[PDB]
Amino acid sequence: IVEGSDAEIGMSPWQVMLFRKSPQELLCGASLISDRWVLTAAHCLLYPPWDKNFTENDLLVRIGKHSRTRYERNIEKISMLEKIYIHPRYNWRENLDRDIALMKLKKPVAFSDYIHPVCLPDRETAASLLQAGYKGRVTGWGNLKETGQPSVLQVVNLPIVERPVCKDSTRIRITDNMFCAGYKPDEGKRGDACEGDSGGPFVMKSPFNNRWYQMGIVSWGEGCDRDGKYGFYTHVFRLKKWIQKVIDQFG
């Protein structure tokens, strides 16, 4: 995360770290949506241009974390993966369209002060909150700059951007399964996700029921925090039918 700040303790208890078993290293962010299911970006698991194609046994999820590098004894919980599910129409060839994946844990994780699931949006909450100017929150342990790395989880609040502005900021073909967020060059403030934040959540706190909803998944950006560029996020609600189908079928 670029130009963010240290998270407070328990500020993002749905935050998940995808961790490589060997060598032991951070792979991506992710989020906890129930005691058995974790949501992430498809490109965290499958990205052929970079020879990336992880299997269940390659990975661990670490839940309840704050420190990036420390083993947080008595606080974090580490889970093995039972199964990975990638959206069948995930477009890794062109533009990361439908950049979404689910991971089912081998065993349910115990909730605690530091571990707790985020809500997924319903149609009404999405319609109400996914509007230009409305701010969401992005969290992760990714790099602090494009070109270094944080001691603890980072957080940044960023405004959703008008679709035509998103489209005009890039040569990449944007789709309805994406939204973009970030400050404009003339807005002064800045901030973005970066390498390593992939798969983490873009959340919003509903003013109607005071609950946190995951509206987006950290997907892509041309560099990190560049003037005139924006971060692009998977539109979780648009893909919720697929999420539900998977959970109903394999839960």
């Binding site: 700040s5 500020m11 208890p13 530091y114």
Partner: peptide
């Protein structure tokens, strides 16, 4: 499920984090 999105150290205790107000103010 029923309890999703309510943080044990924040919403469950009626404590606010340091920047959530920034989000609320943007929801016009």
């Amino acid at each position: 499920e029923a309890d999703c999105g309510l943080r044990p150290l924040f919403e469950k205790k009626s404590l606010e984090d340091k920047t959530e107000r920034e989000l609320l103010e943007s929801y016009i």
